[PDB]
């Protein structure tokens, strides 16, 4: 996996170069906003089980065929599994943010997921909707101004949105 730094070091080494003044500055700025990113992480993490459970419930209400007997999320075995996925996708999205690079997520989670679902008979589009709902709720939780030093988190938000967006995209 790469982190935001290491990503750049990698590209620089295949060119045989040392990182350019420009690119060290770019990283140096990402370093200055360190603190916001971490709040991002602690906030989403510190609310994981609300984020998941609420999302799962609004999904099932929205698509009852999923939990009607015979649907992919009927039976405890499978309901638990489907929950477990939601939570996994979330966990991996938090790692991405922590590390400032999509790779943890792409590599250890999204890659090959589309074909696991297809082969199992799990409806991806449904997963995506679940993921999308977690995105919305995660974002609201990070942007909430209560109990934190005021600032602009809008760049961070956009990045976090991205990770969720590719998880969803990775299963449609």
């Amino acid at each position: 996996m790469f982190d935001a730094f290491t990503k750049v070091a990698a590209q620089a080494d295949t060119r045989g170069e040392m990182v350019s003044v420009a690119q060290i500055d770019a990283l140096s700025q990402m370093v200055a906003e360190a603190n916001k990113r971490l709040d991002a992480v602690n906030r989403i993490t510190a609310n994981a089980s609300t984020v998941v459970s609420n999302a799962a419930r609004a999904l099932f209400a929205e698509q009852p065929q999923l939990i009607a007997p015979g649907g992919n999320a009927y039976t405890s075995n499978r309901m638990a599994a489907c929950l477990r996925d939601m939570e996994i996708i979330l966990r991996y999205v938090t790692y991405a943010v922590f590390a400032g690079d999509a790779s943890a997520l792409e590599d250890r989670c999204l890659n090959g997921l589309r074909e696991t679902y297809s082969a199992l008979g799990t409806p991806g589009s449904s997963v995506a909707v679940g993921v999308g709902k977690m995105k919305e709720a995660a974002l609201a939780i990070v942007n909430d101004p209560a109990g934190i030093t005021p600032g602009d988190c809008s760049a961070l938000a956009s990045e976090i949105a991205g990770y969720f967006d590719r998880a969803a995209a990775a299963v449609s």
Binding site: D39, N42, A46, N47, S49, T50, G147
Partner: peptide, 17 residues
């Protein structure tokens, strides 16, 4: 002190859901 304490409190809460 708060951000961190709450982190453990919330962690216990998550361990319970």
């Amino acid at each position: 002190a708060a951000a961190e304490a709450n982190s453990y409190l919330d962690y216990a809460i998550n361990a319970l859901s």
